């Protein structure tokens with residue numbers, strides 16, 4: 154810096170901000186010849202570019218001043234209205250909720266931390282959970298409680314046990330943060346009984362549930378789950394969705410659905426961070442949904458990703474040594490791998506990269522960073538030939554790591 | 558709320574957030590047939606729509622996957638390169654700076670608070686200053702020092718006095734926030750001597766200067782000022798600009814230019830708030846600049862707003878009673894009026910609205926909310942006939958208020 158010790162100006166929170174040896178390594182990987190399974194990018198082959206083009210023409214013809222002018226903090230009214238109808242009809246979400254549009258789902262998480270979290274408040278997360286929710290929440294200095302997943306999602310029984318111990322210490326949970334369908338990073342889905350069980354606990358222990366669902370329409374097998382938000386008679390769930398995986402990430406449009414008193418506060422919080430989410434992208438999204446394009450396109454997304462998931466699953470089964478394990482997602486973008494014999498996947502990344510493959514080490518997906526033998530693999534955005542090849546290079550990497 | 562006392566969940570900061578009685582009133586006024594001079598919107602007649610339409614076609618033809626995919630947190634590289642070349646050539650801003658793209662300049666204000674402000678840190682603002690900068694900064698609990706304006710902008714001599722008193726109390730300013738050209742809300746511009754004086758003080762007292770410049774290209778008379786950032790040999794100025802007034806607000810693209818060490822921290826801070834500013838809009842803004850459209854369009858903006866400023870100034874001169882004073886901006890969107898005889902402009906708004914005109918009371922533009930006889934008038938966004946008739950209704954309101 155040209156100010157020398159520039160840190161002399163930084164806030165306490167800025168002084169704690171660092172980022173991040175592995176994320177920086179993976180940036181560089183993403184630009185080389187290596188087969189990277191490490192990214193969380195949807196495949197641009199799934200962007201509906203013909204529909205987008207017609208919508209932009211329509212906007213410049215009919216909606217130009219609306220698309221181009223400042224919008225309200227709450228969002229573009231027709232998008233808010235069309236989303237609530239879509240969510241009501243498609244998922245059974247109650248029309249008693251209000252809705253705010255956000256600058257992607259990530260912004261919704263920062264706003265949840267601003268609006269709910271005092272330093273020290275306790276936040277429950279899955280172990281693993283979505284890394285950038287931890288990063289959003291960390292600015293507000295929560296304490297975390299981690300609840301492990303299994304193949305049917307959050308072990309809610311362990312949450313009840315941790316809630317009872319917290320009670321015995323005179324403490325309680327403010328927010329339970331869940332990514333219950335095709336989790337990023339785990340791929341697994343919380344079963345129906347556990348969603349209802351979670352809501353019983355939310356009532357009994359008086360907490361808010363944040364249900365963050367980017368991946369739900371990316372279903373390749375099985376039957377649609379019930380949104381936790383659909384089961385929410387008390388108004389304790391805040392539902393987050395986003396256009397990122399179902400339209401394209403580049404518009405940065407998301408939504409938050411929940412109790413009107415919560416929504417009002419969230420609106421006031423957002424107002425000073427950005428004025429409004431980009432209205433042009435909101436107009437695009439409104440046409441995308443209201444003109445029936447969203448519904449028609451989702452089947453093409455699913456058709457595109459399904460074989461990529463299947464390819465990756467098939468290569469894992471054929472190439473991996475005993476007893477590596479992996480999840481078997483019904484949808485979404487990710488497969489989550491556990492290594493045997495206490496291998497540390499973060500240290501093993503060097504070896505993988507030398508063999509031409511990359512993945513994200515799972516450690517940072519844990520609030521307490523205490524699990525070291527996991528990896529997140531992405532099947533949406535590397536060439537399908539390179540999925541088979543990447544999995545083979547990974548499998549050989551693990552073989553070598555396992556000997557002396 | 559469905560949760561009863563929903564408050565029980567809110568953070569300390571969220572408990573201290575409230576909607577404004579005046580802003581809510583003004584919203585309702587905008588939807589009515591009153592002549593409102595209270596808004597801060599640019600005129601959609603100045604949005605370059607035919608150019609925007611050509612850019613949108615070109616993006617779908619050649620840049621679709623870039624415009625639609627997630628982008629890096631720092632911003633779209635070509636936009637960042639083009640902006641630095643533009644700011645270098647046009648303003649003489651040094652190429653030793655870095656740049657980050659933001660979701661409007663408003664987001665840059667929130668990021669400045671996150672990155673520099675601990676509770677209690679001292680921020681200097683002009684009196685008046687831009688309301689939503691106070692709102693952004695307020696989440697971080699600064700103490701403010703207010704420095705009055707005159708017709709040549711911040712009275713930097715009063716700043717020196719206040720810096721000396723602070724020093725005598727063993728205290729320091731961390732940030733000086735300035736909107737030095739065609740101020741929102743005052744309309745005035747800091748002269749050249751004061752820009753250099755401010756930088757001498759920044760050096761002597763070791764603070765950072767935030768130079769927030771949405772309005773610079775909206776010049777109607779006079780000669781271009783020197784950017785404070787263009788005089789910045791020490792790397793102490795963070796320069797903010799935005800496409801909102803020179804393209805259209807709806808894309809929500811802004812930029813922050815300053816010392817590389819500062820910009821790296823800001824990038825890390827931003828990452829978890831929104832991932833990236835919407836890339837689609839960043840592609841549009843890149844073509845808008847790089848293809849020469851910004852430069853050709855700026856003269857049309859000026860040509861459009863100039864007569865509107867002039868009509869408002871003529872009407873003020875003809876209709877206003879003795880004792881009323883107003884600024885005489887060389888550019889921008891706003892004229893700032895001061896009432897005689899201790900009239901309270903917030904209590905007078907009631908009477909103004911009954912007479913068919915609205916304005917924003919100046920009180921909220923003061924950190925300490927301690928000046929009550931001021932008003933911000935906008936001339937960009939209602940029509941020229943309505944400016945004359947609005948100023949007349951305002952003048953008659955002031956006359957009535959002056960009795961008995």
Ligand SMILES: Cc1ncc(COP(=O)(O)O)c(CN)c1O
Pocket residue numbers: 193256257258259260283332337365367394395396397402406407831832
């Ligand atoms: C669980 C989770 N939540 C939120 C997000 C943020 O996505 P966006 O901001 O693009 O809506 C992601 C990334 N798609 C995610 O995986």
Ligand SMILES: Cc1ncc(COP(=O)(O)O)c(CN)c1O
Pocket residue numbers: 427428660661662663664687736741769771798799800801802806809810811
């Ligand atoms: C002084 C000032 N700074 C920042 C902004 C926010 O602008 P935007 O977020 O649209 O760049 C405005 C409104 N144009 C303003 O008047």
Ligand SMILES: Nc1ccccc1C(=O)C[C@H](N)C(=O)O
Pocket residue numbers: 191192193194283284285337627832
């Ligand atoms: N490359 C990305 C781009 C955008 C959003 C996420 C990613 C990811 O890396 C995966 C997961 N979203 C994460 O936090 O790790």
Ligand SMILES: Nc1ccccc1C(=O)C[C@H](N)C(=O)O
Pocket residue numbers: 580595596597598687688689690741917
């Ligand atoms: N946050 C506000 C609330 C009310 C009135 C003004 C403001 C502002 O910050 C000025 C802005 N240019 C406007 O649009 O009025």
Ligand SMILES: O=C(O)c1cc(O)c2ccccc2n1
Pocket residue numbers: 172173174175176284513514516517
């Ligand atoms: O996105 C990130 O900022 C990121 C991603 C990772 O995979 C990490 C792994 C270990 C430590 C920090 C990490 N940070």
Ligand SMILES: O=C(O)c1cc(O)c2ccccc2n1
Pocket residue numbers: 576577578579580688903917918920921
């Ligand atoms: O004096 C006020 O009550 C006042 C006036 C305003 O213009 C406001 C604008 C935005 C937010 C709060 C506000 N409060």
